Amino acid sequence: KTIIINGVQFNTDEDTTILKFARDNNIDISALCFLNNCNNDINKCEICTVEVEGTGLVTACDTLIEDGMIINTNSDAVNEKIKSRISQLLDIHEFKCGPCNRRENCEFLKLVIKYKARASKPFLPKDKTEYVDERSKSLTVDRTKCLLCGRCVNACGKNTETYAMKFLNKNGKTIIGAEDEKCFDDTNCLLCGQCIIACPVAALSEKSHMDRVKNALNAPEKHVIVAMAPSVRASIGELFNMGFGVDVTGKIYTALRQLGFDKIFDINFGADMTIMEDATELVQRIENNGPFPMFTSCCPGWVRQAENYYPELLNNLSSAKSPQQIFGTASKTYYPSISGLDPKNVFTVTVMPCTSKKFEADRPQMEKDGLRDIDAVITTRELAKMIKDAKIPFAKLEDSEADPAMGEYSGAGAIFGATGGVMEAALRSAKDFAENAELEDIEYKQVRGLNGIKEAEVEINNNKYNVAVINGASNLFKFMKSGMINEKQYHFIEVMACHGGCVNGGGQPHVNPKDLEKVDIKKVRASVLYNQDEHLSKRKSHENTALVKMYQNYFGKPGEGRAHEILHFKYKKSAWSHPQ
Ligand code: 402
Ligand code: SF4
Ligand code: SF4
Ligand code: SF4
Ligand code: SF4
Ligand code: FES
Numbered sequence: 408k409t410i411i412i413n414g415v416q417f418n419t420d421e422d423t424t425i426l427k428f429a430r431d432n433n434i435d436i437s438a439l440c441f442l443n444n445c446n447n448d449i450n451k452c453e454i455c456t457v458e459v460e461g462t463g464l465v466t467a468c469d470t471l472i473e474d475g476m477i478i479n480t481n482s483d484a485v486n487e488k489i490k491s492r493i494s495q496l497l498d499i500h501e502f503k504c505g506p507c508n509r510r511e512n513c514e515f516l517k518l519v520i521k522y523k524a525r526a527s528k529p530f531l532p533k534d535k536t537e538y539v540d541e542r543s544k545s546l547t548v549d550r551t552k553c554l555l556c557g558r559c560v561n562a563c564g565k566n567t568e569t570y571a572m573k574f575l576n577k578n579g580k581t582i583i584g585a586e587d588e589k590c591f592d593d594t595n596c597l598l599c600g601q602c603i604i605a606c607p608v609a610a611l612s613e614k615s616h617m618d619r620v621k622n623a624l625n626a627p628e629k630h631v632i633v634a635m636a637p638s639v640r641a642s643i644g645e646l647f648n649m650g651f652g653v654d655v656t657g658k659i660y661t662a663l664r665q666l667g668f669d670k671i672f673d674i675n676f677g678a679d680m681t682i683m684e685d686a687t688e689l690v691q692r693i694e695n696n697g698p699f700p701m702f703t704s705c706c707p708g709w710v711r712q713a714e715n716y717y718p719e720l721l722n723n724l725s726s727a728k729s730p731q732q733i734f735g736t737a738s739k740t741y742y743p744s745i746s747g748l749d750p751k752n753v754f755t756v757t758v759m760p761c762t763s764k765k766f767e768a769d770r771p772q773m774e775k776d777g778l779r780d781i782d783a784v785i786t787t788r789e790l791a792k793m794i795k796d797a798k799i800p801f802a803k804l805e806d807s808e809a810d811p812a813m814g815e816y817s818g819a820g821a822i823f824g825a826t827g828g829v830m831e832a833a834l835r836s837a838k839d840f841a842e843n844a845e846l847e848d849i850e851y852k853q854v855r856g857l858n859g860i861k862e863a864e865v866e867i868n869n870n871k872y873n874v875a876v877i878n879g880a881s882n883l884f885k886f887m888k889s890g891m892i893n894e895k896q897y898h899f900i901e902v903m904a905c906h907g908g909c910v911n912g913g914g915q916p917h918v919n920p921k922d923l924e925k926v927d928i929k930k931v932r933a934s935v936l937y938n939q940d941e942h943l944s945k946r947k948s949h950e951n952t953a954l955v956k957m958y959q960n961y962f963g964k965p966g967e968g969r970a971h972e973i974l975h976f977k978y979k980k981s982a983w984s985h986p987q
């Protein structure tokens with residue numbers, strides 16, 4: 408068929424939208440509510456407006472190309488309409504970018520500047536309390552910034568299929584929010600933060616723990632430990648104009664030291680701990696030929712999904728604490744034992760790519776003798792904001808190392824941040840354990856990648872076992888509802904709530920749709936972790952020298968005794984009750 412766009416003739420066979428065809432051919436068309444191959448069907452934003460001869464103004468984002476179409480994307484009428492839409496949005500938008508947390512990477516401000524739009528009447532509510540919801544331990548809503556674009560709703564539907572984010576009718580006005588406008592924590596919401604990642608403005612954000620960290624740092628008697636998740640070192644550079652896929656581990660260590668933290672550890676050490684415990688548990692279930700299957704329990708989003716939809720599986724989840732919580736528990740017990748610090752004066756902070764980790768850290772029972780395992784969790788974005796507010800020249804910093812007592816990590820722990828990393832590491836350790844060997848073939852590429860559901864057969868002690876990696880909460884729903892769990896006997900199943908793994912976490916740096924279309928952020932971010940694992944000498948969790956010392960001199964045998972007593976956390980279904 409033949410297409411004419413801005414006077415240029417194309418002869419094509421594709422069956423696609425005007426927007427996608429124009430972007431494939433370097434023709435600029437604006438867009439806002441279109442994301443994840445979906446737009447806001449009920450109140451289209453119409454910023455992708457184009458003129459089609461014989462039809463009039465159409466939305467390029469959901470209008471398929473067809474033979475004989477003559478399109479104009481830059482006429483005075485088209486730009487007039489788009490600017491009118493942006494002005495109408497500003498009419499409901501508190502346009503005060505100074506203190507806004509999306510000041511530096513906001514799609515809406517970009518469009519406003521592009522079209523020189525201005526509100527017909529400035530939106531200036533002087534009682535913001537009715538527009539804000541800070542009840543959640545993980546999420547926060549600021550509806551003075553909400554464009555009602557629907558990208559959060561669509562993203563929740565696609566990534567989790569829970570539809571916990573919904574359009575609501577509050578006092579005859581349309582808002583976005585949780586079921587019955589409740590606190591997200593009190594619903595089936597997973598707190599995964601994918602809605603945040605899909606928001607083009609500062610309407611949805613993470614629950615800030617920055618004041619916690621500041622107060623702890625400024626308290627004279629507090630010894631503030633900091634430890635970052637695997638994915639942080641593969642991601643934060645994006646917010647300092649360093650590009651995608653840049654390993655900035657040493658820069659992060661140096662920046663953390665410059666921010667005043669008293670000890671620089673690493674959550675990958677806790678990942679090696681979790682692998683110790685989980686591989687021991689798996690080898691035991693194997694030698695006992697049950698119980699099966701065993702689910703990972705390190706992803707709090709998947710933990711909430713199980714609690715809210717599949718309580719019958721809670722008993723099959725590993726009792727090992729997640730890397731964050733296991734690290735914190737050890738930080739309040741073993742670390743004082745090798746340092747002399749009063750355990751009550753230790754304040755443990757984690758840097759996570761995740762908003763659900765905030766909920767996990769504040770679980771009432773995630774403490775001991777009155778000491779929280781983890782006292783504060785800040786997202787990648789939060790750490791970036793802290794670094795910039797301190798005017799630390801991150802991109803120019805020299806590399807430093809972490810304190811090794813709880814900062815060393817193997818490649819097994821290094822790849823935790825990618826989908827299938829936990830399973831690969833656990834297999835690396837479990838095969839050696841069960842066969843009492845030091846096997847050299849350790850790479851399990853079969854469980855890697857962005858496939859939603861990845862199954863594999865593995866040979867351990869010359870018996871065959873079936874493992875599955877569930878990559879995304881929606882894929883968990885598909886795996887369960889489909890009956891796939893019953894096609895064969897599964898023995899060890901990894902589950903991540905965020906497709907691609909923690910590298911695509913809800914607390915990660917925002918990426919504009921164009922950059923997303925030109926870069927596979929999931930793959931490029933996981934590339935850093937897999938390279939680290941490639942170039943590490945210790946690639947099995949149980950080879951971590953610092954962790955081996957910790958277990959030999961303090962915790963003892965993993966999976967039992969003091970180790971099980973302190974480093975484990977068993978989820979349990981709620982007892983039968985009536986009514987509900
Ligand atoms: N706790 C923990 Fe994990 C580890 O180590 C992070 O820190 Fe993850 C990441 N990156 C996050 O958020 S959680 C689930 N297991 C995979 S990786
Ligand atoms: S959301 Fe964007 S346009 Fe609105 S105040 Fe924040 S930076 Fe400015
Ligand atoms: S919260 Fe963000 S993504 Fe959701 S409707 Fe409002 S502006 Fe759009
Ligand atoms: S946190 Fe996750 S489950 Fe909850 S509304 Fe947002 S995307 Fe949906
Ligand atoms: S996959 Fe990682 S970032 Fe996403 S909810 Fe689970 S732990 Fe958090
Ligand atoms: S981008 Fe097409 S209607 Fe919003």
Ligand SMILES: [Mg+2]
Pocket residue numbers: 445446447448469
């Ligand atoms: Mg549509």
Ligand SMILES: [Mg+2]
Pocket residue numbers: 623624625626627629631667
């Ligand atoms: Mg201090």
